[PDB]
Amino acid sequence: NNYCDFCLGDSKINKKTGQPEELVSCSDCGRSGHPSCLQFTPVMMAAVKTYRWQCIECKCCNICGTSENDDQLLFCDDCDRGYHMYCLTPSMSEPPEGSWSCHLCLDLLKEKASIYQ
Ligand SMILES: [Zn+2]
Ligand SMILES: [Zn+2]
Ligand SMILES: [Zn+2]
Ligand SMILES: [Zn+2]
Numbered sequence: 095n096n097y098c099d100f101c102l103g104d105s106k107i108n109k110k111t112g113q114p115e116e117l118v119s120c121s122d123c124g125r126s127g128h129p130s131c132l133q134f135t136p137v138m139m140a141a142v143k144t145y146r147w148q149c150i151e152c153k154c155c156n157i158c159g160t161s162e163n164d165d166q167l168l169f170c171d172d173c174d175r176g177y178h179m180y181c182l183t184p185s186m187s188e189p190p191e192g193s194w195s196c197h198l199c200l201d202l203l204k205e206k207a208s209i210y211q
Pocket of ligand 1: 098099100101102103108109110
């Protein structure tokens with residue numbers, strides 16, 4: 095929990111970059127990483143600190159709260175939250191093309207959301 099799974103560093107030292115960098119930790123299993131190690135964009139690096147982020151193994155739909163039907167569980171390209179295609183309104187029959195930003199991110203980030211330009 096107090097070490098980055100990817101570089102084995104900690105909050106005091108990112109071993110890849112040499113800089114101090116906060117860890118983000120999965121709210122369910124404790125899997126931790128530096129945001130840069132997790133290869134998050136600066137927008138996502140920021141977003142995962144504003145809510146109880148979950149790693150891919152633990153990720154649940156933010157709407158229904160389940161981790162079932164992973165073949166329909168979208169990840170927002172800005173905040174990394176999961177959403178089932180069928181939980182969205184309107185429901186999506188097929189996955190989207192290109193980048194996809196959830197409603198929370200569109201509201202908060204506006205023009206900085208991935209879906210734009
Ligand atoms: Zn790291
Ligand atoms: Zn986890
Ligand atoms: Zn759902
Ligand atoms: Zn989002």
